[PDB]
């Protein structure tokens, strides 16, 4: 009985080792954040437009100018290989088969190059900056291997206090490795090359990365660039002013700061202020959640745990299934509210509760 | 111990096969919609008018100009024959005995003609449009058989995702049939007559039926015509502009779109804008729910599951009982708030919570 | 362990026959009303005034011009004899010992005269009108026996639908009788005297009693007169205009209409509009509930179930105990908020939540 | 598994005798107050400032002009010796080791002098006034022994009705004594000296202590003076007008008046009106609670039960641990919201929910 994302979560919890399941499902501190990410969607209800011809519906939509089957993406998530063998590839392939982009995490279990070589869909690369020099290396790799978009994640200055991992003393599975970091020279005896090892043996990122650093990166990357982790129209506007082609409003699926607002709380305002593509994630599970954000102006929604449940439960076929249900879910919702074309969504179909 | 509608639900759940019970009680997706339909009534409380002579009370009221014992109706519900033998007839007879209208669903287990022949109460016909041509046939049948009012249901462009039926793999009982469709010629070898079979072997409706189509129907039907499934003062106003004699605000008892607003949320506004009869359903279980909607301007309330619980629990006598309790409930409520005449209800007796 | 009213309820439920307990604790329909009566008190919180000399506190206060130990009264409740032997007397004596009034219900188990003969405290008489003629008789009896105040209860036009009694098929204990009605001549063969029996064998009241009838009563009774059962500043104002010396805002302890507002919701407005004594009841259990209403302008609070729990649990000594705890509770609360004199309470010490 | 304050509470409940645990954890009456103290923090959520260099963070801050490691203090709590041997000393030492002040309660199990002799950190003395004369004695003792700050607690005019202690018939452990009162002469046969014994054998305080009395105290104490127990910007402003150097907004950890507002409800207003140091306590458990109050203008937060859980669970080492976790918690939170310097906190980083 697999008819929604929740059913896949249930199945995933039965198949995953508790430790891994907690790594996946867990949130920061009390986990009031993740609950909030879910609850915030009830602040809006639908006001369908009747007697509208919805016999022919369309979910197609442009994201940053490029058309894709639907306004969805499989967002960047670390250690997918722990959920299922070659998890990263299984995800990218289901995404490509669904006609939507896939974002490879800097902390993936499959390197930037190997994926690009084994998958021809639209690949995006999410970037964390541990060491500026090493950062430039990955960016260039992703560039030379055909990744169309770069995403800078900024909400992990320091690691979120996730008590589930603490209790379980979570440890990256032995057979898994941070493949994008493998090979990084450790022979040089001079300056860097040694302070670099300091960063490399340090599971902590460059907390100094600031606006000036964003400029640096904007020059390095010539294609579409997005800043992820924003929770304010002000920050989103600055990102656009500094060169970003768009932003991703999110609270990292409630895994960084338990009391962070839901990005849904600043979506309309960010959309109105930036005048540029505003994507979003964190809390999405139902097609209705997705449509509400879209109706509010979001350009597209990135899926995090949702598709991961499909991966953990049934691997690649599982992701396909989740993507299928969600597409059907979205389509069904568009029909129900009388908005046959997904690109015509607006605040009109919503009611503030 | 049968003193309220809830008691009948309990009894019905004990007598119905789980599968049928779920078909009856179930809602869309998470079923937050049905819960909401119930909760919305707590947003209003009573402010009784004391020292008012309520020794002589009257529940009589005109609905679309015709007087009936009380502002209630047994709304259109499909597959009543699955709840109890000849369920459709049992309902129409209890309605007629109570002095209120009965609405026969396009998907009833008893045909338009047979009911009209076995029942002389005020019969209304609810219409779904699968095939325009077949639609015209039923409308004319209902017309020639004496049905006084036609109701076009518009919130089923596509079928609601009702997960209870999915888990149970619900299937229309073998001994039951969609009687209003039986007999529809299947011999013609030409154009229609074959594309018609396409609609007929397709448990899916004409999602293209739009405002232009409403005009078509308005000409075909010469008597009172209502549009059901509206959830906005705007749509209700358009319906009036297009010819409708009134509208029925509803979210299909939370069975079509889980996140739909409750029609109670747009009742006052629809009443103020249309200046025409505004009926309502979805969530009604207590006389107090009914009075609140009436106090807000509703012309009458259509009962869905409430009377069905009486049917499933004790057949025709069960419906009589439910109608009796509710009438007593309403009467008792009118007395309590100091409004002896139901036609004098107004926002005055309410308090926004 | 008896330290609050709730502890007495617990004890009372252990000693009372379920049937009687349900008669006492029960409310109308779903009983959302009684829950609401309790919850409404959380809409206000205290803002104590520090460094105020509260070494000498005073709970004394005038009620309708007459001073009493504290702004409390044991309100009118029917069938007290079912809770404990000679319940009516036990209550009046504890009230008198506490220095506050006691209100005898028209439906008491001890007649107006017998109580007045066995108790010298301040006795008030609550009146229900079944038959105008019989009503005049009781009023005059209460008048000639020294009752200082008359209270007309108006929220029982018809009896509240209390499902607990329905399930239990509640029946007035055999050894108990409606003593204020006993003796009423049944010999006359003429007009009244026979239509009177119609009222007397009818556990239903005069639902016609209106404003004109209030005038009638205002002339009959020469002393202090209050109208009980009001739930609107408008009705309270009319009562004053018609002669009442004050009013009692209440929803009959949530026993008449489940969806009625809490009188706390219209207390400030009634106080501001009438410019006359506004008393209140329904939901009071803690001293803090009492102080909040007092701070809002209430002249005094009538206790219903609270003192009855003391009666049912430990008879007369039980009521004394409840009154003692509550007085200590109130006193302690006054001290805590820095208002040493109960007559100085005002909206200042409150915070709208 | 000790990763947060709650874990220490759990451990403390397993090690403490129920009676003592209830004395520590318990609140007034229904204990809606303590729940409220916790819930009020959800009325605010964070809006992090991204791409801010937080590689170098600072929690240092001035409190009343004196710098300390972080804006925290271990507040005054009575009978710490009942939670753990020499509890008072264990607390002061952990506080001193953490670089923050410690406040000794008038009702401590270790006298003002002994502590000052065994601990060289910044010691503050909280004062209750039972007898003015005895009060002056303790103040002078604290003065001559080096206590830098005096804190007058005003929310215990009378003792809070704490039903847990009532049920348990709580009694101060035999081996424990109110050491600051020990030795107080009981030989004098004259006036005071006998009315003093009246206060001394009276576990009740001087409820008359008013503003005039505050003036008296302001002259007596030459150093920093704070008034604790305030719940209104008005009272805080008066305190400043009367000489106070600052105030401590608090409801005594919900132990005095169950329906008291949370001091968080008047923090911003008190900060805006007084223009002077406004400290706060009551309900703090997470670093996020602390940052929210700080962001709202609080000068520092006093810990009550939080550090006591560490004491009861693991003595002095337990307190160190709690202080360590909280410091790490605060630091981590500052980083997450993009405010590297704790002294730069402002309403900007908050979102009203
Ligand atoms: C197991 C797991 C690992 C994650 N790893 C990363 C990562 O490596 N890079 C990144 O930018 N975001 C990371 N995220 C955050 C996601 O990109 C996304 O913001 C989040 O999951 C959205 O919320 P949702 O899970 O409710 O959909 C991770 C989330 C989860 C659940
Ligand atoms: C078992 C069941 C079948 C239904 N079938 C139909 C139908 O055939 N035509 C229609 O117009 N509405 C249909 N409805 C919707 C009802 O007309 C009505 O809008 C709804 O039940 C109102 O909500 P309530 O059940 O809370 O009263 C159905 C509802 C139920 C519960
Ligand atoms: C067992 C019971 C019997 C009652 N009988 C009467 C009555 O005879 N006359 C009347 O005026 N009110 C009557 N009341 C209502 C009370 O006067 C009062 O309004 C109500 O109890 C207040 O609410 P509380 O119970 O929460 O205090 C009754 C209430 C209870 C619980
Ligand atoms: C066991 C216990 C004893 C207390 N004793 C005192 C005292 O002697 N003097 C004082 O000023 N406050 C006293 N308080 C109140 C605290 O100073 C502080 O206001 C309160 O604990 C803050 O709330 P929290 O426990 O949620 O942090 C006490 C609190 C507790 C829990
Ligand atoms: O919460 C998150 O998203 C990160 O902690 C993932 C993450 C796990 N191991 C890493 C090594 C370097 C950079 C990021 C990671
Ligand atoms: O939810 C509803 O109300 C419909 O699905 C009922 C329904 C069940 N079988 C049908 C065949 C044709 C038209 C409508 C129906
Ligand atoms: O709810 C209430 O307060 C009344 O029903 C009490 C009540 C019980 N038996 C009666 C006979 C005559 C008048 C009132 C009563
Ligand atoms: O709740 C509180 O904080 C006080 O009751 C503590 C307290 C306990 N015993 C005492 C003796 C004298 C002064 C205060 C106390």
> Is any ligand 6 atom within 6 A of the Cβ of residue B138?
no
A255 φ, ψ to 5°? -105, -5
Written as six digits, the tokens of D287 are 């670093």
| A contacts of B154 (beta carbons < 8 Å) | 50-51
**CB pairs < 8 Å spanning C and D:** 86
Contact B286 C257 (CB under 8 A): no
Cβ-based neighbour number of residue B254 at 10 Å: 29
Q: Which residues line ligand 1 (CB under 6 A)?
A: A 24, 37, 75-78, 105, 107, 126, 153, 228, 250, 252-253, 255, 281-284, 303-306
Nearest-angstrom CA–CA distance, A54 and A337: 9
Select from A163, A164, A259 the residue whose CB has the most chain D CBs within 10 Å, as the one to mutate to test that interface.
A259
Nearest-angstrom CA–CA distance, A338 and B235: 12
Q: Which residues line ligand 8 (CB under 6 A)?
A: D 78, 106-107, 128, 130, 156, 159, 178, 203, 255
| B contacts of A4 (beta carbons < 8 Å) | 29, 163
CB D244, CB D257: distance < 8 Å: no
Written as six digits, the tokens of C214 are 């209030």
Cβ-based neighbour number of residue C264 at 10 Å: 24
Chain B positions with Cβ closer than 8 Å to A: 29-30, 32, 36, 154-155, 157-158, 160-161, 163, 166-167, 206-211, 213-214, 227, 229-232, 235, 238, 256-261, 265-266
Written as six digits, the tokens of B77 are 């519900």
> Is any ligand 4 atom within 6 A of the Cβ of residue D281?
yes
Written as six digits, the tokens of B100 are 């209120």
Decide: residue D209, CB within 10 A, 0-12 exposed, 13-18 middle, 19+ buried: buried
Which of the residues of C are catalytic?
A: 252
Contact B261 A46 (CB under 8 A): yes
Which residue's CA is the closest to the ligand 5 atom numbered 1? A159
Domain boundaries, chain B: 1-353
Nearest-angstrom CA–CA distance, A143 and A147: 6
Cβ-based neighbour number of residue C193 at 10 Å: 14
Nearest-angstrom CA–CA distance, B258 and A205: 43
The residue written with tokens 């107050």 in the block is D33
Nearest to B48 among C211, C214, C257 (CB): C257
Answer whether A touches C (≥3 Cβ pairs < 8 Å): no
Residue A300's SS3 state is coil
Ligand 1 center from residue A252 Cα (angstroms): 5
The residue written with tokens 């007898």 in the block is D131
Fill in the DSSP letter of residue A81: G
CA distance A230 to chain D (A): 7
Cβ-based neighbour number of residue A14 at 10 Å: 10
For A93-122, b/e burial (b = at least 16 CB within 10 A) is bbbbebbbbbbbbbbbbbbbeebbeebebb
CB A13, CB A21: distance < 8 Å: yes
Decide: residue A67, CB within 10 A, 0-12 exposed, 13-18 middle, 19+ buried: exposed
CB B260, CB A45: distance < 8 Å: yes
Nearest-angstrom CA–CA distance, C182 and B272: 55
Fill in the DSSP letter of residue D262: P
CB B91, CB B319: distance < 8 Å: yes
Nearest-angstrom CA–CA distance, A35 and A33: 5
Pick the ligand that lies closest to the CA of residue B82.
Answer: 2
Test site for ligand 7: of C108, C127, C203, most ligand atoms within 8 A of the Cβ: C203
The kind and range of the H/E element at A308 are: helix A305-337
Chain A positions with Cβ closer than 8 Å to B: 1, 3-4, 42, 44-55, 286, 288, 292, 329, 332-333, 335-338, 351, 353
CB A179, CB A195: distance < 8 Å: no
Give the β-pairing of C246-249 and C278-280: parallel
First to last CA, chain C: 32
Which residue's CA is the closest to the ligand 3 atom numbered 21? C304
Decide: residue B251, CB within 10 A, 0-12 exposed, 13-18 middle, 19+ buried: buried
Test site for ligand 6: of B77, B126, B130, B178, most ligand atoms within 8 A of the Cβ: B178
Residues 6+ apart with CB under 8 A from C17: none
Nearest-angstrom CA–CA distance, B307 and A240: 58
Assess whether B252 carries a catalytic annotation: yes
Pick the ligand that lies closest to the CA of residue B25.
Answer: 2
Nearest-angstrom CA–CA distance, C114 and C112: 6
HEC readout, chain C? CCCCHHHHHHHHHHHCCHHHHHHHHCCCCCCHHHHHHHHHHHHEEECCCCCCCCCCCECCEEECCEEECCCEEECCCCCHHHCCCCHHHHHHHHHHHHCCCEEECCCCCCCHHHHHHHCCCCEEEEECCCCHHHHHHHHHHHHHCCCCEEEEECCCCCCCCCHHHHHHCCCCCCCCCCCCCCCCCCCCCCCCCCHHHHHHCCCCCCCCCCHHHHHHHHHHCCCEEEEEEECCHHHHHHHHHCCCCEEEECCHHHCCCCCECCHHHHHHHHHHHHCCCEEECCCCCCHHHHHHHHHCCCCCEEECHHHHHHHHHHHHHHHHHHHHHHHHHHHHHHHHHCCCEHHHCCHHHEEEC
| D contacts of A238 (beta carbons < 8 Å) | 51
Written as six digits, the tokens of A278 are 């505003």
Ligand 3 atom closest to C75 (CA) = 17
Nearest-angstrom CA–CA distance, B94 and B327: 13
Nearest-angstrom CA–CA distance, A167 and A69: 42
Ligand 8 atom closest to D159 (CA) = 5
Nearest to B51 among C36, C211, C256 (CB): C211
According to DSSP H, which parts of B56-202 are helical? 87-98, 112-118, 132-144, 163-168, 195-200
Cβ-based neighbour number of residue A330 at 10 Å: 23
Contact A329 B161 (CB under 8 A): yes
Residue A344's SS3 state is helix
Contact D51 A231 (CB under 8 A): no
CB D96, CB D165: distance < 8 Å: no
The residue written with tokens 């009740």 in the block is D204
Strands (E), B237-277: 246-249
- C-alpha distances out from residue B172 to B86, B114, B134, B168, Å: 15, 21, 22, 12
Q: What is the largest CA-CA distance in chain C?
A: 74
CA distance B250 to chain A (A): 11
CB C253, CB C286: distance < 8 Å: no
CA distance A128 to chain D (A): 12
Given phi > 0 = left and psi -120 to 50 = alpha, else beta, which region is D275?
A: left
Bridge-partner residues for A66, per DSSP?
A63
Nearest-angstrom CA–CA distance, D76 and D81: 13
Test site for ligand 3: of C255, C264, C308, most ligand atoms within 8 A of the Cβ: C255
Nearest to D49 among A161, A209, A235 (CB): A235
Specify the CATH superfamily of domain C1-353. Answer: Aldolase class I (3.20.20.70)
The kind and range of the H/E element at D117 are: helix D112-118
């Amino acid at each position: 009985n697999l008819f929604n994302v929740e059913d896949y979560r249930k199945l995933a919890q039965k198949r995953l080792p508790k430790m891994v399941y907690d790594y996946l499902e867990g949130g920061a501190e009390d986990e009031y954040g993740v609950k909030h990410n879910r609850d915030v969607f009830q602040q809006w209800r639908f006001k369908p437009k009747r007697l509208v011809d919805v016999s022919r519906r369309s979910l197609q939509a442009e994201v940053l100018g490029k058309r894709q089957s639907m306004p969805l993406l499989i967002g960047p998530t670390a250690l997918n290989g722990a959920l299922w063998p070659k998890g990263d590839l299984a995800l990218a392939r289901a995404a490509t088969k669904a006609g939507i982009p896939f974002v490879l995490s800097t902390a993936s279990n499959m390197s930037i190059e190997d994926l690009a070589r084994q998958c021809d869909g639209d690949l995006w690369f999410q970037l964390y900056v541990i060491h500026r020099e090493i950062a430039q290396g990955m960016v260039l790799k992703a560039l030379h291997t055909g990744y169309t978009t770069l995403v800078l994640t900024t909400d992990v200055a320091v690691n979120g206090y996730r008590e589930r991992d603490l209790h379980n003393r979570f440890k990256i599975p032995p057979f898994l490795t941070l493949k994008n970091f493998e090979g990084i020279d450790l022979g040089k005896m001079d300056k860097a090359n040694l302070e670099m090892q300091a960063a490399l043996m340090s599971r902590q990122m460059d907390a100094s990365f600031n606006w000036e650093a964003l400029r640096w990166l904007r020059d390095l990357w010539p294609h579409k660039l997005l800043v992820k982790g924003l929770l304010s129209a002000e920050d989103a506007d600055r990102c656009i002013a500094e060169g970003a082609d768009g932003v991703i409003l999110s609270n990292h699926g409630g895994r960084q700061l338990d009391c962070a607002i839901s990005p849904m709380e600043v979506l309309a305002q960010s959309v109105a202020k930036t005048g540029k593509p505003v994507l979003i994630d964190s809390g999405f599970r139902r097609g209705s959640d997705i449509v509400k954000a879209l109706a509010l102006g979001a350009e597209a929604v990135l899926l995090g745990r949702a598709t991961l449940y499909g991966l953990a439960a049934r691997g690649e076929t599982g992701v396909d299934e989740v993507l299928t249900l969600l597409k059907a879910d979205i389509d069904r919702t568009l029909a129900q509210i009388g908005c046959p074309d997904i690109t015509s969504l607006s605040p009109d179909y919503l009611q503030n509760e």
